């Protein structure tokens, strides 16, 4: 999930966008 | 895990900004 | 619309903390 | 939505809980 | 009042920063 | 108090120190 | 310690949210 | 205190209420 | 003006996110 | 400046990008 | 690199408050 | 930079002031 993906490596804006509706 | 808890707080703010009018679902 | 934008930022942080493990849906 | 409900009059923790998954 | 609620959130953050080890009360 | 003084006009960090312990 | 410093910032925010009108002391 | 209890493991809002006035 | 002061706080967080490794200059 | 541009109307990501180095 | 990312967010907020009218330069 | 200086050991307000315009 988002914590696994983005809390050990920085997520880019595009990666963060993944979690938008 | 506190590190993850603090990370999550920043993630939700980032999603708020990035997602705009689309909104988002947050789940750990 | 800026006031609502600022409020929303605080709302998502509050939901993060209130909802904990369950997470939440932010649908504007 | 939550913005309409909560951005003029303060929503309690109980009220916010309604938006949890 | 949401305006006071949001103001106070930022006030607490500022107090945390400036008050250092001495700390602070938030009361209102 | 702090709301009347600082939510109605900007208080600097210097001014806010007055509200510390 | 920066880790404690960042943790405390989030703690104050949570206390502000949950403590309502009663408020809180932050001391550490 | 609060740092030892809550910076070392997650404290819920319920748990944090114990640190209110 | 407090509204602008609170707005600025959110603006700097948004710039932090948007600008990434570029960084930014903040001036009111 | 940024306050004039972005505190009375919401700035998009592109508008915010204006202020990056 | 996430820890530094989170720290930076707090740094920019602190600079916002410390620097006030002057603003600041965030150059990572 | 500031991240290197300030993300392990706490920077004082005085230290942060060095990064103001
Ligand atoms: O990977 C992350 C974690 C937290 C905030 C963010 O913008 C990115
Ligand atoms: O009604 C609100 C608005 C923003 C934050 C909050 O906790 C409540
Ligand atoms: O006057 C204020 C109000 C809120 C936060 C702050 O740093 C100053
Ligand atoms: O255990 C913690 C630590 C920091 C913020 C929080 O809401 C809970
Ligand atoms: O117009 C604005 C004001 C504050 C934050 C933001 O993302 C946009
Ligand atoms: O060294 C630091 C890091 C983050 C915020 C702050 O006020 C100081
Ligand atoms: Cl953090
Ligand atoms: Cl605000
Ligand atoms: Na998606
Ligand atoms: Na630019
Ligand atoms: Zn943080
Ligand atoms: Zn705010």
Curated annotation (Swiss-Prot), chains A, D, F, H, J, L:
Disulfide bonds join 6-11. It comes from the Eukaryota. This is Insulin A chain. It comes from Homo sapiens (Human).
UniProtKB/Swiss-Prot annotation, chains B, C, E, G, I, K:
It comes from the Eukaryota. This is Insulin B chain. The lineage of its organism: Eukaryota, Metazoa, Chordata, Craniata, Vertebrata. The chain holds residues 25 to 52 of 110 of the full protein.
